[PDB]
Amino acid sequence: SNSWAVAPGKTANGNALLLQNPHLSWTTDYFTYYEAHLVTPDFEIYGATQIGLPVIRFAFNQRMGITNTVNGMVGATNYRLTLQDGGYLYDGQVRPFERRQASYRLRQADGSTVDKPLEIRSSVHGPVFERADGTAVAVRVAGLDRPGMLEQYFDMITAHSFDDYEAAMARMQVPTFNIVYADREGTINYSFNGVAPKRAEGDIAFWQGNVPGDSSRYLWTETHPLDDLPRVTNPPGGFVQNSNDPPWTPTWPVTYCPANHPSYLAPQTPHSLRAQQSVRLMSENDDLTLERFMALQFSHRAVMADRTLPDLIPAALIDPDPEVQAAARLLAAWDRDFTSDSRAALLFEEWARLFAGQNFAGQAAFATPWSLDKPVSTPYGVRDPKAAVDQLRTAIANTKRKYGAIDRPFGDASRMILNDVNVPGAAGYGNLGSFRVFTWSDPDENGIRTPVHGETWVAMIEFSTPVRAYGLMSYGNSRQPGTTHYSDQIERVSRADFRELLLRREQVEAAVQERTPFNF
Amino acid sequence: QAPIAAYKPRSNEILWDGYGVPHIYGVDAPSAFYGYGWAQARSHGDNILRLYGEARGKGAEYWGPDYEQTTVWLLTNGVPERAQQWYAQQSPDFRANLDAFAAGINAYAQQNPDDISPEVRQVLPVSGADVVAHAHRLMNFLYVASPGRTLG
């Protein structure tokens, strides 16, 4: 997911700008987003939220707006238990488990149900589970005593001022997510939100693994207040951003550093190329207009190519295999952008899968390692060009095997297909540097692939008076069998032809195609 | 300076645009949430009822083995029962919105039974607590504590 909030001073018209851009599976039911607009005499809200949720998570109105990205807040701890004499060893003594005998029904093939016993065991840590390898794990989830998640989101999005907004957030009822905010008053904010356990030792890596469940030494009981978490408001840089990267470059120049917070709050790992693009696109541009803002969101640069081809090409050209040479020239003439007509893109991806792993996050192959001191220009170069060329050799075979040729047009293989709509794809993997994301699936027998995750709800809003906003939903606003609103937006997505979002009554009335009166 | 004058809805109605986007107008908060529930049932009823069914801890009961692992995960973590607690712990004002939302979903199914897949009809009617249960499952037991990380 991506998120941008731009301050008035960094814009041409003097109004804040906001980008809602969450990335999630295109098929997972509980991850499906839904667009809606609610209006009462006291409040108005427009935006997307996951189906089944009564509150809009990605919302905005005439006053304010927010967006979310996953930050992976470590709100739970998995403890490894030391079983002994029917119980578990804790602080030098064998403790008995709390045991509750429950049951649930299991539907049978003939429609009937079978009553099935379920023993629920718990240690002081929390519920206990047994892994396939036989490891006994107790999961301790924080924030189980925070029933106001939904109401907090509601009060946040209907807030009349940033102060009221922060007061709502301070309730600490939303257990996770990075949240970005912007309003018509000109304030922008980035918050590394979530319910984080207070711990006296151990870095994030330690707490993400199996923590020793045999000592009260690791049994936390309190959580951090909103003031203890990384946050930024109206920074000198005039913007805030987050593309799932650790919260160490939320703006430029930064306003804090890793040493300013406990080391278990967030990783200090290399920022993805997509995140580096996010920072560059905002910091390098000034006097932004809503139009330019949108154009920037469409960025689909093969940043990985800029960091590797300078070293890879010359090495490949000296290889005896003429096919490797031809591949080197193909890659060399590429403008390094994931456009539909690119004949080198698919081949580059295949190479990168080997050079940087299947998720393209590998760091071992670069010559210059990532550095927070050069957060948007590292890692760089190819450490071992010889090996890299052997990797290209293998990539050449993989590309031909998957797509039928080493120079098949990107958009000919990459398609967005919903119902009977089949359009050419563009943009691509975020870890390769593409800001606009489409995580292409593996290709089928004919080399055709489609998005499995990526752009879903995308909206850019300018807080002028009245506000102006544009948006699109990749997979439509409905998935009910037979609906005409599942594949009716994908064609516009393929051309980045955004819909103006309608908040004003007059606009809605002019666009209405169906009226549903109702009574409660 | 001041925002544009707000609209004062004088009747409850949903105005749908050409892309299936519902513009829900309510004379008060409960009415709007009701319309929102109706709209979501219209656009995504089948999967929502299915998800609510799982959050109740009745996935295995309603649909079989393919939903048994999640049932065991949610029951062991006491999600359905905690949802009942969180629901009761809601402020009166907000609980009325959750009740209205659930009522909107039930009303849509009532007026449009043909749009509800046979397999999920047994889930109805839904309640405010069901809405809380799903949200609780999604936030705490999907995003924060996933079964994958605990079980491996």
Curated annotation (Swiss-Prot), chain A:
Q: Which domain of life is it from?
A: Bacteria
The active site consists of S1 (nucleophile), H23, E455
Q: Supply the name of the protein.
A: Glutaryl-7-aminocephalosporanic-acid acylase subunit beta
Q: What is the lineage of its organism?
A: Bacteria, Pseudomonadati, Pseudomonadota, Alphaproteobacteria, Caulobacterales
UniProtKB/Swiss-Prot annotation, chain B:
* Residue range from the parent sequence: 36 to 187 of 720
- Identify this protein by name: Glutaryl-7-aminocephalosporanic-acid acylase subunit alpha
The organism's place on the tree of life at top rank:
Bacteria
Which residues are in coiled coils?
none
